Write an enzyme that holds these catalytic residues in place. Structure first.
Site, short mmCIF file in Angstrom:
data_model
loop_
_atom_site.label_atom_id
_atom_site.label_comp_id
_atom_site.label_asym_id
_atom_site.label_seq_id
_atom_site.Cartn_x
_atom_site.Cartn_y
_atom_site.Cartn_z
N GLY A 101 -17.55 30.35 -30.22
CA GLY A 101 -17.85 29.89 -31.56
C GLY A 101 -19.28 30.18 -31.95
N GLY A 102 -19.47 30.84 -33.09
CA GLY A 102 -20.81 31.20 -33.53
C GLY A 102 -21.70 31.80 -32.45
N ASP B 4 -13.80 15.45 -39.42
CA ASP B 4 -12.98 16.62 -39.09
C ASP B 4 -12.30 16.44 -37.74
OD1 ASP B 4 -11.74 19.12 -39.24
OD2 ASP B 4 -13.47 20.17 -38.40
N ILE C 158 -14.52 28.83 -21.07
CA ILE C 158 -13.50 28.06 -21.75
C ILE C 158 -13.43 28.42 -23.22
CG2 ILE C 158 -12.82 25.72 -22.37
CD1 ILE C 158 -14.56 24.95 -19.80
N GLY C 159 -14.57 28.57 -23.88
CA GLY C 159 -14.56 28.56 -25.33
C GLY C 159 -15.73 29.29 -25.96
C1 LIG Z 1 -10.97 23.06 -17.24
O1 LIG Z 1 -11.77 23.09 -18.38
C2 LIG Z 1 -11.12 23.15 -19.63
C3 LIG Z 1 -10.04 23.98 -19.81
C4 LIG Z 1 -9.43 24.01 -21.05
C5 LIG Z 1 -8.21 24.92 -21.18
O2 LIG Z 1 -7.20 24.60 -20.66
N1 LIG Z 1 -8.27 26.13 -21.93
C6 LIG Z 1 -7.17 27.03 -22.09
C7 LIG Z 1 -6.91 27.30 -23.56
O3 LIG Z 1 -8.10 27.75 -24.19
C8 LIG Z 1 -9.19 26.87 -24.03
C9 LIG Z 1 -9.46 26.56 -22.57
C10 LIG Z 1 -9.89 23.23 -22.12
C11 LIG Z 1 -10.98 22.40 -21.93
C12 LIG Z 1 -11.59 22.37 -20.69
N2 LIG Z 1 -12.72 21.50 -20.38
C13 LIG Z 1 -13.83 21.31 -21.26
N3 LIG Z 1 -13.88 21.98 -22.38
C14 LIG Z 1 -14.92 21.82 -23.17
N4 LIG Z 1 -14.95 22.57 -24.41
C15 LIG Z 1 -13.75 23.25 -24.85
C16 LIG Z 1 -12.81 22.23 -25.46
C17 LIG Z 1 -11.73 22.84 -26.35
C18 LIG Z 1 -12.02 24.13 -27.13
C19 LIG Z 1 -13.03 25.07 -26.50
C20 LIG Z 1 -14.17 24.33 -25.82
C21 LIG Z 1 -15.97 20.93 -22.79
C22 LIG Z 1 -17.17 20.52 -23.37
C23 LIG Z 1 -17.67 21.04 -24.71
N5 LIG Z 1 -18.02 21.46 -25.71
C24 LIG Z 1 -17.76 19.59 -22.52
N6 LIG Z 1 -16.98 19.44 -21.45
C25 LIG Z 1 -15.87 20.25 -21.60
N7 LIG Z 1 -14.75 20.47 -20.85
#
Ligand SMILES: COc1cc(C(=O)N2CCOCC2)ccc1Nc1nc(NC2CCCCC2)c2c(C#N)c[nH]c2n1
Length: 260
Positions: A19-20, A132, A16-17
């Site tokens: 950073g650092g 923030d 998903i993501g």
């Molecule tokens: C199905 O899953 C996800 C999908 C997406 C999504 O649509 N896309 C497309 C665009 O680009 C980013 C991903 C977003 C967030 C989802 N779910 C999720 N995301 C988490 N972190 C992300 C949140 C936002 C920025 C990057 C990290 C955390 C976390 C922590 N920490 C604990 N539980 C989390 N669940």
């Protein structure tokens, strides 16, 4: 690709993501249940970066006892080289969801608003000012909004820059900050959720986008709308003087949150 954590194994659906030194993965447990997993490579991180993460884990661990608008943290593993946090997985974050949308159900905006107030209210009760806040700090899960970051740890970016739109004024004027400052940033998220744009999305020039935020004789426009309660909420969140700005406990007593 897989990940064992305190006994259990997990298949890495996708990342998903970033950073650092961190990454977040959508993953499945052995029972095809879905989860998120944050990974921090500790190999080098100053004891400031290190203590940042220890503080997040502790607060995340304590706070979820007090409100289900905080992300669940099911389990974790810490060593000198890595961290793994197994968390409830969101459908998506508010920021991405927002930018896909335009049909913005008013009953849903209202309900997401209480969602964010409860979450932020919870961390304020244990002495945290996020300071923030932004849509990327909230996860839509079960038609609900849940806070993720607490402002303490390095937040992450999505994987296929960030903004200043949500900066509180006293944040700027502070470089020559209270629970009030999150009220501002929540206001910008609601403003954005109602008017489809944040206050100063206008000014694309940053070094002076900041001016507008700092400037008293510079008015944010509040187009009249059917829900004038909502209009009033934005009007009291986006007051430049934190002393004159509305508090979270007041916000939870405001008609927009409480009627219908
Ligand atoms: C199905 O899953 C996800 C999908 C997406 C999504 O649509 N896309 C497309 C665009 O680009 C980013 C991903 C977003 C967030 C989802 N779910 C999720 N995301 C988490 N972190 C992300 C949140 C936002 C920025 C990057 C990290 C955390 C976390 C922590 N920490 C604990 N539980 C989390 N669940």
């Amino acid at each position: 690709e897989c990940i064992s954590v305190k006994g259990r194994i997990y298949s890495i659906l996708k990342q998903i993501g970033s950073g650092g030194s961190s990454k977040v993965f959508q993953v499945l447990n052995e029972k095809k249940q879905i989860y998120a997993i944050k990974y921090v490579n500790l190999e080098e991180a100053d004891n400031q970066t290190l203590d940042s993460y220890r503080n997040e884990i502790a607060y995340l661990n304590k706070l979820q006892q007090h409100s289900d608008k905080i992300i669940r943290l099911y389990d974790y593993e810490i060593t000198d080289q890595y961290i793994y946090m197994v968390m409830e997985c969101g459908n998506i974050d508010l920021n991405s969801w927002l930018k896909k949308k335009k049909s913005i159900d008013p009953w849903e905006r209202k309900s997401y608003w209480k969602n964010m107030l409860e979450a932020v209210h919870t961390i304020h009760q244990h002495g945290i000012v996020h300071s923030d806040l932004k849509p990327a700090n909230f996860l839509i899960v079960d038609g609900m909004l849940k806070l993720i970051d607490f402002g303490i740890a390095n937040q992450m970016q999505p994987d296929t820059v960030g903004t200043v739109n949500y900066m509180p004024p006293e944040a700027i004027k502070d470089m020559s900050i209270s629970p009030k400052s999150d009220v501002w940033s929540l206001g910008c998220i609601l403003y954005y959720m109602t008017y489809g744009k944040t206050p100063f999305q206008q000014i694309i020039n940053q070094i002076s986008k900041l001016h507008a935020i700092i400037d008293p004789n510079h008015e944010i426009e509040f187009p009249d709308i059917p829900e004038k309660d909502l209009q009033d909420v934005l009007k009291c969140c986006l007051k430049r003087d934190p002393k004159q700005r509305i508090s979270i406990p007041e916000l939870l007593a405001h008609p927009y949150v409480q009627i219908q």
